[PDB]
Every structure is written in structure tokens, then in C-alpha cells.
Design a protein around this ligand. Sequence first.
Ligand SMILES: CC(C)CCOP(=O)(O)OP(=O)(O)O
Ligand SMILES: CC(C)CCOP(=O)(O)OP(=O)(O)O
Lengths: 281, 283
Amino acid sequence: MDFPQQLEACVKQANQALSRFIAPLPFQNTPVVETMQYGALLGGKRLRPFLVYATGHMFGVSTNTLDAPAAAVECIHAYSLIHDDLPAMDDDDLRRGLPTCHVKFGEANAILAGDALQTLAFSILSDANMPEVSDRDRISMISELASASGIAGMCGGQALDLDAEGKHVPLDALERIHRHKTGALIRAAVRLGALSAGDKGRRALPVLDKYAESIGLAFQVQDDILDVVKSTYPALLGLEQARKKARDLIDDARQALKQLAEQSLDTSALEALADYIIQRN
Amino acid sequence: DFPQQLEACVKQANQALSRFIAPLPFQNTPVVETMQYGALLGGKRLRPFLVYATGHMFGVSTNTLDAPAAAVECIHAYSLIHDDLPAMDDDDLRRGLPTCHVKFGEANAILAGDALQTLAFSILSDANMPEVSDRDRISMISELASASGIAGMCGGQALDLDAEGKHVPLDALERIHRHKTGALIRAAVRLGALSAGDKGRRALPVLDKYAESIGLAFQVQDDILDVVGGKSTYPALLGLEQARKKARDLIDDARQALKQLAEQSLDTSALEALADYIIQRNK
Ligand SMILES: CC(C)CCOP(=O)(O)OP(=O)(O)O
Ligand SMILES: CC(C)CCOP(=O)(O)OP(=O)(O)O
């Protein structure tokens, strides 16, 4: 199967995993729970779950066990978008070809839905059945998701980003904003997949981190290029050197995978992802 | 002496809170300045009091209890920052001072509340709790999450909104409170007990009774004090004096639940003083 079919397949897996935890929730007939479902399940590429699944599978972890961190990272991802769309934030009327949550359900419902999705990520990690995941590793997973999603990571990146409005920050500052705003949660997806496998996965982390941060930045560069085809990669470097940048970052990602392949790990899915990113634009 | 124990637990909870907020990165950013303003300035710290009092009953150290005390207060703090927003309760003032969104703008207030919720989970998974088991630590995280999310606090805030000016009946009103404020108050007690482990876990059945009783009693008493100190309240549905009776009956339950524990060599004096304080407050 081609990567487009793989993405379709993961989207369906990520979607099941998501609904398996969302459907048993109380208050289903309320605007807020309806907003949570709209905001979490309708559209999206599910790249964070993909990373959890792909990384976990390399270490021989079942899809059942991985459904948990895959849904949990997507819950953090979904909540951030709901809050980021708010008029006080990015103020978006449309997302995923659909009116954003605050437009459809109202700001209060959007605020609460986002708040509750964050919490659900932690309930999932602390409650989901993961038969071969030790208690120590589960705490590492929770700890990782929390530092990556909070002020040290995602929130902290969003803070920096709003502060950078109208400041035309240099490339190094820009990459720092991205590393925290999106890099941290993408690194978390990979880290949760490997922690899932225990000590074996825990040893591949320094290399997996390099892969994750590199593809995290490569995604942002491609997004920026797609926008033209605040500071952005193209605005700072010019189109050609932004394309070069994405190519450089994917090379960095492949070097990381090279180290994993040398440890007899199947990097095919992670390699397929680097391939998909660089063929973009 | 109890009003002095409260001031003592407040200064302590604040220390705990600062312990976990101060070393965070980006200290010189509006968002972080907002988390500090919202978490630390003003408040009675009753949830932390519940954590400290329940834990101390089992001889758990304060240094250890600083974690669950700070974590529950972060959840509480974040809920107020978000609830104060114009789209929600729309409050310009709180604790006698401008609210977060008024002082720092909505964007910051939104982000700071989000980051405080995350911090609660970073505290429970990272804090040094030398005597706390991994299975218990996990139970402490699971509990905070269930109590704070759609099944607890957020779900209560929703029920409360979806009921905007609907004159809900008594059962619906109690359901709103049970989730909106009861769950987190019970979580405070449940976390204090969990840190102790086995001894604490066996006390939960009775501790929950105490927690649920005082949780509702706080709300009934708030309603009473709003009257003598449309949306449904206890005096509006029951009558002022029937609301007082209701609060009094709740504290009785709380005292009885505690007897059962004091009947197992547990010093319930602090939890007793709190139950008495609830029903006795005049402002
Ligand atoms: C483009 C956009 C505003 C949506 C943000 O999410 P994202 O593009 O980081 O999500 P993925 O790159 O993981 O698909
Ligand atoms: C004044 C008053 C007791 C009402 C404040 O209620 P709150 O929920 O903000 O805090 P408590 O639960 O500690 O009372």
C-alpha cells in the first residue's frame, strides 16, 4: 500500500481509538460533549497518532496498547486547536473545511470542550489498559505528555508565538517558537510510543528525539511554502532556501533513522513519513 | 485557633504553589506572569487544606503533601481563570482584585488556565514523594483527572451553562454542584488519603462520605450567605430556613462519617474544625 492509503488506515485507527474513550463519557446530549466530538473526530490527518503507532510497532507493542497514547496525544492536539481558534487567539472561522468549534457551538462551549479534552488525555493515560506497560513507564508517559503539552512545551511555544506578533523575529527565534509550539508534542508522540515498549524503547529515545524534532520542523517549513505557493521560513530565507531547509531537515531525520536501522529496527513507516513530507509542494 | 490554622495552611499552600511555578521556564512572559497572578493571589486554599489534613491523619509529611495540595489548587485556580472570561461568568473582579483577563488580556488568561491544568499533572507525575507508591501515584493522577474532566468539574460547569436561567429543580441543582465543585473537593480528600497508601485507601469509603457532605454544604451555605450575608439556588427552591436546615443536616453527616474514623484511632480534629467552620461562617 501507498502512504496515502496508510494515512487513511491510521486515520480510521486513530478515530476508533478516540471514540472508544469518548463514547463512554457522560453528558453526551450536551453542547460541550458534542463540541468535544466535533473538535476531536471530524477531519484531521492524525499524524501524532501515526507517530505513536509507528514508533510503538517498531518495538513490538500491540495496537490495542498503543490506542491509549495515540488517543491521548490527539486529545492534546485537538484541545489546542479549539483554544487556538478562539477570537482572542488566532480567531479562525474555519478549520478542516468546517466552521471552527467556537463559531458552531459558541465560545463557552469551545473553552470547556478544550479544557475537558486536555483532561481526557490524562484519564486515558492513567486509566487505559496497557497490559505490558509497567507502572514506572506509565508515569513516564504521563510525565512526558504533561511537560510537552504545558508551558515547557506546547503552551510555552504558543506564548512565544503570540509575543512574536509584529516583531519579525530572526530564524533562530522562529525555530525555537516552532520547536516548542509543535515540536514538543510531536516529540511526545514518538516518546510515548517508545516508552510503551519499556527499556528497549527508552534506549532509542535520543535518536528518536532527533528524528521527531527534524520532521516537526520540516512540516512547518512545508506548511509555510504551501501558504505562498510575522516571520515565516519563506519570508526570512526566500522560497528557494526554504525548500533547501526542508530538504536539510529531512536529511537530518533520515540520519536519525539510519542509526535505528543499525539497531535492527524496522524504520519503514517512519521513513515513509519522511518521504511523504519531502514530496510535498 | 482554627482561623489561625487556616492562615497557616494558606501560606503553606502558596509556598507549595510557588515551588512548582517558580522554576518553570519563560518566567518573564505574560502567560507565566498570569499563571502566578491567578494561582497565588488571594483564596482560602480549602482544597489544599483537605489534602494537608487528610494526609496528616496518616502521618504523611508536608513536603510530600505539597504535591497533591499544589496539584488540586492548580486545577481550582485554572477553573477560576477560565470561568471569569466574558464568554463564561464574565468577572472583572475576584478576591478583591482585577481578574486575569482584565489584567493580562483574554489570550493570556486562556493560555495560563490551560498551562495550570497541565502543571497539575506535571506535579503529580514528577514531584518527589519518597513514600508514595507508583500504583498510588497513578491512582492520584487518575483521580485528579476524573474529578476535573467532563465526568467531574468541566461536566458540572457545562450542566450549569446548559441550564442558563432555567429554574432547574432541586435534583438537577444538586447534580450541577456534585460535579462542578463536589468532585474536586472529594479529589482533595482522596489524594491526601492515597499518599498514605493501604491505610489511606481503606479509609476512602468513609472519607468520601465526609467529602461529599461538606462539598454540598459549602454551596448551600454560599447560597444562604448570598441572601443574608433567574437561577435556582437552595433558598429559592426550598426557602431560606429549609436551606439552613439542609446545610446543618449535611454537616451532621460529615461529623458522623468522621466519628467512624476517629473510632479507628485517627485524629479527626482538623476535619472536624473545618466541618464546624463551614456551617458557622457569617460572611
Ligand atoms: C494547519 C493548521 C493550522 C493545523 C495545525 O495542525 P498541524 O498542521 O500541526 O497537524 P499535522 O501537521 O500533525 O497534520
Ligand atoms: C466565599 C466563599 C466561601 C465562596 C468561594 O468558593 P470557592 O469554590 O471559590 O472556594 P471554596 O470551595 O474554598 O469555598
